[model samples]
Target: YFQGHMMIHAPRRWVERHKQVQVLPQNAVEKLISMNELIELVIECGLCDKTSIKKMYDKINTYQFMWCIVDTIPASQYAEEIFKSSLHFLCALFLVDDAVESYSANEMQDLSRSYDILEKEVCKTFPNFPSINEMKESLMHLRNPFDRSSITFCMQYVNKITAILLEEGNTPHHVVYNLRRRTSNAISIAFQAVLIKSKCGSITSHEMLWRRVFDGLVILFYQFGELISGATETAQQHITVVTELRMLGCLYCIVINDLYSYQRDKLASSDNMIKTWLLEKTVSSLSEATARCSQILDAIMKYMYQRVEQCMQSNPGCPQLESLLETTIYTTVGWIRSHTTVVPRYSESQLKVALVEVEERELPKWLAEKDEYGWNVVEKFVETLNDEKHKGILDALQGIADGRDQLLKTQ
Candidate 1:
């Protein structure tokens, strides 16, 4: 979504401004000039130092900017500017030492602790960074079908799944399957909590329900480790939970990949086999997969709500879990909409029809207008989502769902 906006912003201008050496600090400017001249001298003499060449090769292979330069930069004045700009740009980008400084002083130990659980322990197995901030933000945004307690419990569930992935080295498929299962299980328990609190008509009942969800989430996370560590072998008993979770994980992977590749497939000239294949497929397959996942989760939520209503018939309290369920479903729907509708690979006619069918709903007038702003917003959203910071937000959410489910059953 963010990439869509980025596409309209004119990368050429940014690239040009970034290439200007006048803005670079003196030391960086000096280094750029020296490196450029040294490279040129070597090229002109047809003599390369083995050590320098090895180092340059390694740097290009290991670092993103260096790789980009090695791949794209030509032997010209333009290349010199691009190389210098990329170095200057990266220096500016990583100059912020706030996260590092905080880590050193340990001022925010709790935040550090949370990150350790997420990073070293949970995200260790994944090659990507898990977005704790986005997960927290998404939870905070829940208003209708979710409450803080339910959201917190569900989040913990996700965290547990991350922990499993990190500790167990599970294949991507198993990791996703487990997450979906745990989320489904947590949803089920949250429903029961809703019934208990509604029927009891007691404020304490609310706390009790939250306690169950929270306790269940913690237990689920621990049991996930236990289950994988050969402490117990009852994993087969949770077949339905595991299957659904895997499906959710798979769906998330598909959408997230699409989101990540928007620029490469749509804007850039690079070839992506998956995008090409998907574009050629019938819209129905895409629509059906997206809708089916949403439908299953929706049905689960509706069933939970029915139970809550039945329990509340003789009482006078609204279920809190309903709100949490709604937020999760709505957020998922938003994700699906943002991913499928605006891909450039699709023909205008195909995209229009896909959007209608996928939303099973009307497009906003602004979105239908296909004006600059709307298109820009979509690109920007996609770009932001693909940024290193937000890299694993969806996966983390899925992980939390899994962790919370494991916690519930164990408790």
Candidate 2:
């Protein structure tokens, strides 16, 4: 219902080249078999409609992206089933986001209502996750339905996310951060379920450490950098090695994403932290906002260097934890770089052409109606624009899908 027409151009690059560091070499992501088959199974189980499934294929490539993340920076080595389930969780979450943004409140609620029985059964078996071995015991359940646990998590996530998106007026940046944190916790818990699904040899003694690292990555995913902004009255009290790692991680990932995706997100007017902070008066102009973001990014890189130096100079008892910290940082940097630069989704020229097409077709029709048009017509025009915009997204999606396939073949 709310749309802004202000033409905000993409901001200039803020962070320096050296600040964007990537140490680990990019490893080949084993092509997850039967990608389309998984999508088909979702429909067969009545979990998604044809339209929603098509929308997902055309909009985002979360499937391949998550596969890369799990494969390259695996939670546990040689756990292919766990890796597959993790991919499912990410895809389901992506669908939940799309539904909230695209569906009406009642439509969303009704979708959640449809899952009542499945969710209840999931909750009954909640903490006791089914082992990967059990899931593999029979071909009857060989459809990898264990990933269905994420369906319940998605239902819960939609309700909370819908509430936050429904907030009226310019919601402050911190308020948005807090809302994301609340939702990210549920996501973290779902991942924990994946983590505990198997106590394989790789994660036998390192269970606690594995959970700690995964939670840090989840926090990193959510970008809750409020803790790192020096208002640490509460943060200082609870500070530990893990919390510090999280603060650095939050700053690093968020800044890099905003820096790289600035043009596409600005053109589309999608939800972005840079735009949000500017709206909330946290930063005056786009340039100022980006400058501040770059500054933090550079500072984080320096902190990592200094921490590594200290670790090298004085031996720590558990170098495994330090090793994980280094691995997470480098893997994340390499992974994000590969997606944004190598097989990126949004290009400046491509998005501009798409924007023009949407503007040319829809705006003129609405203007032609003038004051004679009712809200129904206006709403219809918006829906038309939304559909047209996805057509543009589909073009971009196809471009990446081709690139992904070629890369997979090379690997």
Candidate 3:
């Protein structure tokens, strides 16, 4: 099949022609390439089929065009113990997703059992090679940063992720009971949860003074957004305006990335929320599918602007939380914009040509739909993307645009 044909070629091309998986510090970037190599050695020794190796490697890194865990960590303060643990945890999360997405009932059980053995054996140190997967379970059970309680919230949710993925059903698509399971797959709870734990423990219900680590706001943003599909006013009360924007920011990244990778996902027989919806609704063409993708993004962006307004309206200072919010958005946007320069395996023209081929030959449909939601939304959103009263938002954002400008200059 064309899918498998493309699969084997991708990694070979990744090494020789240069892949565009992610853009981060050279160390973080290199860590994945090494992880890729490490994975190859282990998986190859497992004697899985050669084709399966390619499928398996996709699980190793779920790098996005946006900033990932490696990008957010400030120097030295990133716990080296967990630093090492996190990389492995990061690798394992995707493997679970890959299994849930592509593997069979028997296979997943075998895979999970294999991890159970690896986890118990030698995950903590080198001969031990601290289990990144183990850290995932450990992170949940670790001392709660918040006051003592009967329940372990992290453990509850951590368990939920795998449960959501592997739950079998006698339903449509023959994939999961339905495609929402696939849509929710974007949660990346494994990575996000680890990031949340490493940064701050559970978001204590109390509004403590020390809880101002903006990342906590970022974490709750996803929490609220995950449930935001049908969220209520009461739900909004528990979240900060900053958190709302952070969740919007992340959801925006996931949806847009799905659009961009439409063809690649199709080739792999993978599911995308937009694609799933189009299929479920029986959308006929790329144009309509693109429209639907645009509509959802616009709705979210509209809310993003609305939140900025409420923040300025309710309470705040000149460069207060608004400035902090601005820095978070622009800095994240800057990291994502770095993708324009990460060495691509294809020539600029070749990449364009390949994208066109997929769109025309394989994607939701047709080539011009390539214009789906990236720049249109960006130009529409960013040009109007501010609270005029909060114009001071970008005062400290000089570095964000400036940083993107630097990447452009170097290229």
Candidate 4:
């Protein structure tokens, strides 16, 4: 293994200066430093055994910290200067590490040379390249982190693409699955990097950086949607696992977001769009989203169930996937119901008026009982998932599908 080091000492000092300027809370800073130390420990372990399984393990462990930090930080505080600087640093580190791992030694050398040339070009093109901090600050002020008015916003955009993929019959399941995985992984990495950076005292004081990062996330979602649209237009083979996982991820976001924003959203609005939509719609949009997600999941689970039903129909093999699915579903249901009382209720006259308007507007049923078929599919999958029998089943199915596809092409 080739050993290399990039000294980020100056960047660290610059971060410390910025931290002092912001007068960050002592507790918060300490927490951040502790998190940094944890990251360092993991990075060191990976670096020491660059060619071993330890490196892979370290990469996974790094994601744990990333997830925790992102989940903990308030959405409102995302754009703070302190957060930006820290996030940028973390982004830089992740990018560098990813680049290193992805490239061969010769490729890395070529990249380094190219970077040196670009650095020089940048200096020449903008003599004050390093002095553009104020521009960054100004940009941060102008951007709104929460302004997701566009239908094409990242979260919704990905959902739209996923919806199209589900509707398209000619496209193979694996292709859609791959697209979702690729897009979700990219977005996840970006968020993870930001979170890690936030914990390193490297974020800037600019609040807009948070918005910018999220905007990039939104763009990624749109890209995924476009890919789905393309897949729909073309009769191409796609991976079911990728599409299913991606949709599950998108659906799960509602649960995660609602959980994270429960307190804040309740305090801020009597009419939270998500809550209103969930309560007022005939089919709960959340339920519909989950149901659509379940369709992709059903394809996976049915295949798994069929494989193991003969041998272990009497007893499921592994319970982890089922447990996870149940946990996800129940957690989502619990969260929606948690604030039902707090949700504003319509009086009889108001209800009658609303129903009149609904009929006039040709609205679908506002609140139907949950579909039993949909719920059963969810439960069956959850059971197979929890039993862990689905793992082997999924692998075999994927293998068979792949082999058949390759054979067809050869023919």
Tens digits of lDDT, candidate 3, 241-333: 544355456545554445445644245233345445565554564445555544544444445545565776676554444444444344333
Highest TM-score, which number? Answer: 2
lDDT of each residue in 1-411, candidate 1, tens digit only:
121221111112112322322334566445444555544433332234445533543433212333212222223333344344334222221221111222222222332234233333433444333343444443343332223222333334344444444444433445455544444443444333322322323223222222322222222322322232222222333332232332332233233333344434245112222334345632554343333323332333233233333434643443332322222233223333333432222332222212222121322332233433223322343344344543232233333432222222223
- Give residue 122's lDDT in candidate 4 (0 to 100): 32
Instruction: Identify the runs in model 4 with alpha carbons over 4 angstroms from their true place.
Output: 1-238, 263-273, 278-411
> Model 2: which residue pairs collide?
none
User: Which runs in model 2 stand beyond 4 Å of their true positions?
Assistant: 1-31, 49-64, 67-78, 102-150, 153-184, 188-240, 258-262, 265-273, 276-286, 307-319, 335-339, 342-344, 349-411
Q: What is the C-alpha lDDT of each candidate?
A: 0.32, 0.37, 0.33, 0.30
- Assess every candidate by TM-score: 0.22, 0.44, 0.38, 0.23
Report the Cα lDDT for residue 192, model 1: 34
- As for lDDT, the candidate ahead, 2 or 4, is 2
TM-score of 1: 0.22
Ranking by TM-score: 2, 3, 4, 1
TM-score: which is higher, 1 or 3? 3
Ten-residue segment with the worst summed lDDT in candidate 1?
5-14
lDDT for model 3, on a 0 to 1 scale?
Answer: 0.33
Q: Compared with the true structure, what per-residue lDDT tens digits does model 4 show for residues 69-170?
A: 232231222123223233323333433344343344444333333322332333232212222232123223322221111101222223333444556454
